[PDB]
Design a protein around this ligand. Structure first.
Ligand code: FES
Ligand code: FES
Lengths: 159, 159
DNA sequence: AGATAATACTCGGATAGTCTGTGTCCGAGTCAAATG
DNA sequence: CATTTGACTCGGACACAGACTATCCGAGTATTATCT
């Protein structure tokens, strides 16, 4: 099972695409009724991964670092939910009475290999789609004036 | 992160191929030095999915009910860790001041879409592989006499 | 007008509460045997 | 050969943990209003 908060961060990435100004955490927190503190924690988890930049001062907030096309889903999932792979091999082939010697274990145990390859196919099929593809499909479906309209609501009265 | 106990159950899928007689959890527990109780819990979790049969009595144990070829890795992982998906959409687009109305909510959020497509590819890479590929690769690499040999060790003194 | 110091707003990590695993346990049920 | 015992099996119920969730107050900077 994976973290729920990832959606919170990802639904912030999508809205920030249409935001030309710096936006403070608390604003987004109210933008979808979430613990302002814990969204701010998620933003810290993104600032650590150098995905977003955190400007200080009166006109402070969070801003996208690189263009929307170059940010893949994989980068987000790896940054937030935890970079560690999902399945881990406890190496039980080297435990018990019939422990395979260190001479016949030149290859990885086919179970581990298959599961790893599956996880790789997961994260690859995830990485193929970017945030730009999503913003293009949302301005295709939910109208091209909705997302700029939200981007305009976020910047209402900064100082 | 995924449940550790998944590996414990999946390494047993191979041994049942070589077990002609009923084999109880405790024997497998020593077969890879693991919690006899906690492996047994995972075995019960798998028995509930109706993959293997658990027979009680003196010469009782766990046996494969249906052929090894029709049991994919997908069936095992979903049985043990839980069939519920890892990622969960709480529908945050209908909460807060800028809640997407219940009229623009005909289709599933494109984020869910991408995450689905990724997990689907994951589960597809799980379903493609069977137990026949596992027993074939272990008889290909660690010799075709290893699997019958361990299957025979399991049956050493079933009284 | 320009320099300066008060100011007000915002990141950042350090801090408690709660929730699904993780490990363990003993009882109900069952078959095989030992026995008259 | 029927029966009693016996001991061995799984099944679900019981504590412990690391981790996710939610939250606080301290560090840093552009606004800004004043003072010369
Ligand atoms: S030793 Fe862990 S997958 Fe085989
Ligand atoms: S509202 Fe949940 S994935 Fe977009």
């Amino acid at each position: 099972k994976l973290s729920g908060g990832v959606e919170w961060a990802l639904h912030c990435c999508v809205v920030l695409t249409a935001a030309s100004r710096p936006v403070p955490a608390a604003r987004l927190a109210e933008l979808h009724d979430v613990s302002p503190s814990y969204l701010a924690k998620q933003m810290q988890a993104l600032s650590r991964a150098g995905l977003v930049r955190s400007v200080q001062g009166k006109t402070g907030g969070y801003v996208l670092t690189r263009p929307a096309v170059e940010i893949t889903l994989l980068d987000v999932v790896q940054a937030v939910d935890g970079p560690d792979p999902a399945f881990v091999c406890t190496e039980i082939r080297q435990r018990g009475p019939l422990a395979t010697p260190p001479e016949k274990c030149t290859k990885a145990c086919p179970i581990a290999r298959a599961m790893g390859a599956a996880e790789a196919a997961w994260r690859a099929s995830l990485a193929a789609t970017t945030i730009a593809d999503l913003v293009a499909t949302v301005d295709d479906e939910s109208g091209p004036d909705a997302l700029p309209g939200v981007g305009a609501w976020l910047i209402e009265g900064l100082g």
